Amino acid sequence: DRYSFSLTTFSPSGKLGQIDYALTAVKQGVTSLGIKATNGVVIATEKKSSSPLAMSETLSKVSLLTPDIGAVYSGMGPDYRVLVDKSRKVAHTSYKRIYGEYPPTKLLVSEVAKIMQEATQSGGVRPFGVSLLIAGHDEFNGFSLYQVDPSGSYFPWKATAIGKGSVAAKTFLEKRWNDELELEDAIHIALLTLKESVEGEFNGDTIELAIIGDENPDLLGYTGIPTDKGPRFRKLTSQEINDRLEA
Amino acid sequence: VLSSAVPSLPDTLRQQEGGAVPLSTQLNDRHPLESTLKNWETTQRQRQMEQYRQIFGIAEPMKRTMEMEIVNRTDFNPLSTNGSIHRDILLNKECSIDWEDVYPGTMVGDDVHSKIEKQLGI
Amino acid sequence: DIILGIRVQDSVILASSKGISVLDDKTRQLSPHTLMSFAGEAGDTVQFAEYIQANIQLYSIREDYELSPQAVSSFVRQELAKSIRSRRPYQVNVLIGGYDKKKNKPELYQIDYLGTKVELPYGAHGYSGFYTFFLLDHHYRPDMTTEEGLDLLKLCVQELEKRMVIVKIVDKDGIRQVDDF
Amino acid sequence: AGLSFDNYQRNNFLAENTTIVGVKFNNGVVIAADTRSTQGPIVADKNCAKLHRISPKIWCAGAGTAADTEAVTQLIGSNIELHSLYTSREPRVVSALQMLKQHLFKYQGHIGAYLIVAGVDPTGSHLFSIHAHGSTDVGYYLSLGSGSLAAMAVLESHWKQDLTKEEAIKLASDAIQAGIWNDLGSGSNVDVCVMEIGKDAEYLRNYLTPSYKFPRGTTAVLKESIVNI
Amino acid sequence: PIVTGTSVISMKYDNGVIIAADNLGSYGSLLRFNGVERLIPVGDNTVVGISGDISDMQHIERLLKDLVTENAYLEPSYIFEYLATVMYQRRSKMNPLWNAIIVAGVQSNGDQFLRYVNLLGVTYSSPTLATGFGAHMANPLLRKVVDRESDIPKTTVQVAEEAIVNAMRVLYYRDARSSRNFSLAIIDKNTGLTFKKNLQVE
Amino acid sequence: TLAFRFQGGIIVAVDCQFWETWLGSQCRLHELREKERISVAAASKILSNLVYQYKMGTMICGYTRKEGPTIYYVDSDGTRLKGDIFCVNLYHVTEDGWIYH
Amino acid sequence: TLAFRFQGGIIVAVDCQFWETWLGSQCRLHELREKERISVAAASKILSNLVYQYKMGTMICGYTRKEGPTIYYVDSDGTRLKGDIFCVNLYHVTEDGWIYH
Amino acid sequence: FNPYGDNGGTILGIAGEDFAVLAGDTRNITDYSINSRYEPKVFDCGDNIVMSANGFAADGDALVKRFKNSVKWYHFDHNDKKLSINSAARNIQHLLYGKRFFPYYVHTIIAGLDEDGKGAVYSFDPVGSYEREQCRAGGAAASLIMPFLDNQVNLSVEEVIKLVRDSFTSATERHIQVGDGLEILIVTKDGVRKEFYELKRD
Amino acid sequence: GEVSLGTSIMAVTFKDGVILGADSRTTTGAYIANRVTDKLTRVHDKIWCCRSGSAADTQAIADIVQYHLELYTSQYGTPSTETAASVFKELCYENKDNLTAGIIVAGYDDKNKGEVYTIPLGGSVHKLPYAIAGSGSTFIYGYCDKNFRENMSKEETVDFIKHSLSQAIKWDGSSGGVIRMVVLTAAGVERLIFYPDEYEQL
Amino acid sequence: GEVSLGTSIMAVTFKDGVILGADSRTTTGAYIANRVTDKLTRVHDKIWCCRSGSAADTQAIADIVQYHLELYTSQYGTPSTETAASVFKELCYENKDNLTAGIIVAGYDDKNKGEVYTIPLGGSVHKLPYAIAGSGSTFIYGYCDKNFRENMSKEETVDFIKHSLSQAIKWDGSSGGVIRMVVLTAAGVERLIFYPDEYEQL
Amino acid sequence: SINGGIVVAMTGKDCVAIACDFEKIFHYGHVFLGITGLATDVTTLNEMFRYKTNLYKLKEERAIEPETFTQLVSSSLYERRFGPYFVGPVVAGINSKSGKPFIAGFDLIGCIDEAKDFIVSGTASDQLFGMCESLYEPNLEPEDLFETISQALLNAAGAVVYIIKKDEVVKRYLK
């Protein structure tokens, strides 16, 4: 019992078995997309619930890792929930408590990918069955949008979609993206693209949208010391989304 | 690691510690807080298990320790000293920080094969 | 327990003072073109010197290359500091003298018991560290040659024994023993 | 891992050879402190910020070994932030007190952090003081630092039940002024923070604030050089 | 020291000086003797307030009583210099009197007097003086009334008396070695030495 | 006690008990694993490295096919030094072993 | 600082303040009572007996009709010793007094 | 028992070409608590002599007290003749030196005019040793004062008083024991003049 | 520099319950850090603890006991006062070499009605009809014995505790302030507070 | 190895005299060297002393006081209790650095009737209506205050002292044995002894 | 001995000046660090910060800014809180983006003394605190800044002075 044989191994074709199966779980998962605008980033997804009696407020798929970074997933929620808890913890141990500031998006994505990768060679744990669209803002790199897969490979994307409607949505984002997009325009595009992918009812309750954009001092919780400015990640309320839809 | 040539001496070279200068008998003058702080987490965990044994019976500590051993022994990553993600959940340290996490802390004996042998006691 | 070091224009001159009577104390050959001389506590200082010799020798065998004196000096400094971490400091003083074949220039380094490294034209420790600087500083020059250096060392040693050594030279020809102090 | 004791013996061998006050009022709590930092008798750095932020509505101010107070306070701030994110709730002041005191008790007081923790939570306002050994107490008003005795006199003399927001700020500021004048360790300006149950915390930095140009070329230069980044 | 009196506080106002002290002699942590008077009038124009070792205080008291006796065959400064010499000399003899003394009084010319002297012979004057624990609690409070010499003429008897009494209440609340009973002496150039006994802190 | 080296061999004239007794145990193991008698330099080196780890003015003498006659003194502090002459019942040491004189 | 004796006299090149100042007082009294300058041996002896009673590397030099050129060093512990050569702005000492060079 | 205390503060003496200056702060201190804000740390002993003993106040006040008594005795014995600065210096040395094995912990300075009229300043080691110096400072913030002056001096009695003001103003800025008031005594053939200036209160 | 709990605490069983009383003053040396402290700590709804000795070790132990009892409560229902004392002993005793803890445990249970357990610094457990601890308890040992009676009513016990702690407060200055009392009875937990104006004159 | 007086002593003024009471047990460590000691020492016919602290210094002082009072008596008649206390203070205070003496003085005189003077280890003198000292007195401070009344009769005072010292004996083992009491009154000196069987059950 | 050198840092107008009395002033990109104390600790810290900053540059593809480096040094120093490094470091540099001159000074265990005027460390600092304050003014020119920093260092006490511009650094030696 000193050891445990690896769950993930190469097939005769050179492909990793569990990795490809994990990607399939993401593919069968609910759709989620992100769009990188000139002055912000948008991450959106739609909530499928077991019964209407479920409280939609508790079905938070988009989550905050740092005040300037946010993530959304498609696949197994429990794996994403565990990853976010570790991602937030890692953002404090590795970077903040050492450098006194929150890590940039690329570094945080790399450390999340490292967590997902170490599960790809282990005798006890299967690879995480989720792909995370991590959106954030950095003082130097600016706005960014990353997609990290179960294999631990993360790629920066101008606009991307994952899940059941990935191919249909990604092609739709292909025809409706440009370097001159405004955050308000991106939200309109994101809501559109999500409308074709969503099966059934489409409103602000079945949809949650978060944006990385201008600061929100009202969300900081305190005043004074202007060098410490608010957060950038904002999760639009169901009220705001409904107003956007009618427009 | 004891010397292969003589199984009664520390292997001064393979045990990279700054020569044989840090001899065994001299690691006795210690900071008063070193011993207590080094194994503080262990004492709390064992004390916690004792209370479970007293109240919930021997079954609960057996289930807790068996799960941890399953996680620890099935996790071998010679390229990372970070604790396993599932280890934090069982220890209930998934939303806590400590100096041991912030400060986790050679050409000869830091290779992967050294940990493979120690992991399997080969 | 006196150790001396002089960095002449093409070599480094290391000198050392010698119940049990014999007819190479306080020195170790780390490399063909590097020599290490140490002084301090008996016992605690030789194991460190032996350990350093093994590591440097291990590197030479592994790479089949001659580690530069500057790299060797740095390695000693880290190991000495790393040694003191978990114990009470011990009186040790190391002189690393070597010829850098890549740069074709001699080099001499001084390492104190606390693990601080100095590149020196000349250096000393022990009873030689109280007056001998008064002589070397007045007479030492950069372009001094080997044969001149041993006159200075023979001169210097003479003052040492008035108020009161085996000599080795490191050059492009390698370590060399000398009877002419 | 953690603090290492890597050079305790070596350092032993080598050796061988402020005012802070908290005032709880009717609808919140007020924390104030001076801004003088001293490296011994010297005033190392004036205009210093001593009011740390554990969370948006939980603020901390400490004395004793400065680094220890900063180290633990930041560490607890991360745990509060992580715990709040984990539980999706506004953090409680009692939460910070438990981990803060448990952490200090773990180090047997070697971490010399004496702190005053004030904040507002969904259950109301709170005000606690913490010692290096982990012992804590709760009071309507508190004082800390070398000028604590002078500040406490003002607090005891003037403090009363259900103080107003304006009165508490004046009382806390006046108490700090007493320490500034009468204690050497305290001086410079006054930093005031006001935390209220139904409002965002107001950090009133600098709330109260009580030629030799040599001709160019005077200093001789041996040589000059340009460094490249 | 074994039996100690905790604190004395005083302040000079426009027309005189006020000095107060609590009537307690503490035996370590025990509030044993709650009847110890520690203000010593030395005439119609001065009072000596003493803290520290009560046994040494009673030795000071007789010297003051001898001082009136030997002279009668005094000024506040007159009395202080006698005490300061004794306190200094006892220090020089390596046999100190474990006391801190405030001499409060009004000179025959109307000049107000407040001088402090301790076991070490260290002496200083101030608009407000306090000993021991009162140096950190009352002195900041009293200084707010008279921060400088210019404030002395601007402070009346009532204001000075109110500040002194208020300082005692704060002093009593936070001083463990204090008592609710205290004595207060007012020396005025016009009305002379007024001496109030066993006042209650409330 | 004293001992010296000469062309014909070595002359010896006149806690510590066990360490020498225990060392006799290790040399037996070395004499077995390598099937050849442990050299004096090794034996002194083993003893030197031990007294150091457990900070006993022990001495070592021997005569080996390759090493020849050698004398090594081990100070109680771990100092190891070779010696032609050592001074601090006569014995004579040859390749066949010691002889009691 | 140093000083030495030679045929032509003495050469000198480069709490304690008072003791030397006070000693200058005693020599004045001795210069008066006996009406003749105090000898170096006496002056050094007086100083030696004092530093001893009150346990200051003072030195003494002089030139006298009978004593001639002599140098005496007085250690802080009371050790008094004569010296031809002493070593630890030039002055020259003659019978007429010192000369500032 | 510890017979020696501390009071902090700083003193400064400058020997002008003709005039002499002695300056010091007025603040009296004990372990971070301000005993008083105005205690005269510099004294005038007459005969164009100004004296100041920094450090332990009880040692300093005694030394000046005995020195002043010696001056009076000197007047009686020498037909009330003026006491020269050099004569006073050696007199103080004997006073300081008279307690070697139990010495004053005071770095005292006396300033005045030597016989010819030039400025004179003598600084005394606690065990008595003294040396004539052009300028000298002693106390807590002495190290912060001398370097600044040396830049600007190494000058009348109105432009040095500027530098001393700035020098003490700089010291009070970065040093906590430096006082909240500056005393300056000016010695000239005209006589002795006292000037006071205010400093930071905290 | 550890904070020791200067206390005057008392627990008294009576006819149909138990009463736990304590002062409100905590002192660091002669200074009163806080005068409104709540020394009555709740380890369970009907079990209340009071601490003596070091304030850090006891506070840590009290949290663990509450944790263990809450763990026990979820499994075997509300614990007894005897069980809580047993928990305290394990922590207090096995850590006696490192933790300086002295405890008084008073609780109510249906099986045993009111009970009081006192745990001196040694770690021993003694069940008593009534218990007194703290620095101020040394001054009422002879008063509680003379006046205590078995099966007293609530009014008598409240008056008995008031008189007992008034004297301990009077003589011990480490103890004082408001007398906070907890009445544990089948009816439920009841809190009482008595200010100095209510008990001093008794 | 000096013998310290482990005592539980008490003096109480009453209507027409004063009563001095003490235990009879003297202990060296845990051992009882003697259990029938007479701790009530006579310095004069109507003045009786009781000793606390070192048994050697106090015994020497008591002999001197009796010598001085006998010297005084032969000249100015029978002394007062105040005079005897004054004699004790001179010896106790001026020798406080060498003698460790604590005294209680109770006497009767026509001018002042009964009086009690207590002299703690510090050497101070305090006149009180009643006084308690010794190791066992710490346990009855809160009982004597609650029960003591002014101008009590002999029976009440005797009962009051019996109850007070019974508790001190009960809680303090350094004090015990027979309760010997001296009643000083104009009628004359009266001796009383109470055995343990007479007061323990109270 | 080479231990106990004095280092001083001053803030000017769009420029900073750091000077010291083997070199005790080291730079990691555009941020300069001066360390005073034990020479062994000075050598060790440089290697540690070179190790940390080099990884920071590689991982982030960006040079470490002085503000970020200030926290890194403080966190590193607090590690070994028991048995710290016998060193007082000083950091001086200019933020690449904002261009605001920045200086800071630390104790043994990393207490950030982010003074806006000047920073000193090492032996004989007590003399240099007052001299800097007497001479220092706000918003000095780079040439005027050199005179003030050099005069304070020389008179307080060879010596070396670094004048740090945005894209230019000047290294000077003094008599």
Side-chain angles (χ1 to χ4, degrees), chain B residues 5 9 20-21 23-25, chain F residues 22 33 49-50 52-55:
Chain B
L9 289 71
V21 173
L23 60 92
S24 175
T25 300
Chain F
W22 165 98
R33 216 153 61 230
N49 295 347
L50 294 174
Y52 181 59
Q53 295 297 109
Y54 293 99
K55 289 186 288 184

Side-chain angles (χ1 to χ4, degrees), chain K residues 122-150:
Chain K
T123 62
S125 64
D126 291 331
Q127 318 177 57
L128 183 63
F129 293 100
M131 294 177 71
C132 277
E133 183 124 13
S134 297
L135 278 75
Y136 175 73
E137 298 179 1
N139 304 346
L140 274 76
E141 301 95 298
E143 315 293 4
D144 189 358
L145 173 60
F146 160 81
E147 310 305 334
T148 309
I149 186 59
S150 60

Side-chain angles (χ1 to χ4, degrees), chain E residues 88 91-92 94-96 98 115-116 119-126 128-129 135-136 139 143 147-149, chain H residues 1-5 7 28 33-39 56-59 61-62 65 99 102 104 198 201:
Chain E
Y88 181 62
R91 183 179 64 83
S92 71
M94 185 63 72
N95 176 15
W98 291 90
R115 283 280 276 193
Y116 168 103
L119 72 167
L120 291 169
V122 172
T123 174
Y124 57 86
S125 185
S126 171
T128 71
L129 289 171
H136 310 84
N139 189 358
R143 279 168 170 163
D147 205 6
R148 54 188 69 252
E149 298 298 335
Chain H
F1 170 55
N2 189 358
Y4 284 139
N7 305 88
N28 195 323
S33 61
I34 294 164
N35 296 113
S36 67
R37 302 184 182 282
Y38 177 81
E39 264 291 311
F56 186 36
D59 274 350
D61 66 1
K65 181 174 73 65
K99 290 180 71 180
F102 185 57
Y104 303 98
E198 182 65 26
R201 298 286 284 179

Side-chain angles (χ1 to χ4, degrees), chain J residues 107-152:
Chain J
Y108 188 98
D109 63 358
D110 291 331
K111 64 179 74 65
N112 290 315
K113 326 309 305 185
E115 280 193 0
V116 169
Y117 294 76
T118 186
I119 300 168
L121 277 296
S124 53
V125 166
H126 307 272
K127 190 200 176 167
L128 307 162
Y130 82 95
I132 44 165
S135 51
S137 66
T138 60
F139 309 107
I140 52 159
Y141 268 98
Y143 178 87
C144 293
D145 189 5
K146 297 294 300 190
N147 297 112
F148 171 69
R149 292 171 285 114
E150 182 65 26
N151 296 319
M152 283 189 311

Side-chain angles (χ1 to χ4, degrees), chain B residues 5 11 13-14 22-23 39 45 70 83 89 103-104 106-107 109 112:
Chain B
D11 194 354
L13 177 62
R14 293 182 184 271
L23 60 92
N39 54 50
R45 178 76 164 171
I70 286 279
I89 299 170
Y103 306 118
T106 307
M107 295 298 102
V112 168

Side-chain angles (χ1 to χ4, degrees), chain A residues 107-130:
Chain A
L107 284 187
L108 183 53
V109 172
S110 297
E111 307 215 50
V112 168
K114 182 174 72 68
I115 294 161
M116 302 172 85
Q117 193 277 340
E118 79 182 5
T120 54
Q121 64 202 344
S122 177
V125 291
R126 54 162 186 74
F128 292 89
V130 291

Side-chain angles (χ1 to χ4, degrees), chain H residues 38-56:
Chain H
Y38 177 81
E39 264 291 311
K41 212 167 287 296
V42 293
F43 305 107
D44 61 330
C45 303
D47 292 330
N48 312 130
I49 306 299
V50 298
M51 178 170 173
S52 179
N54 196 243
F56 186 36

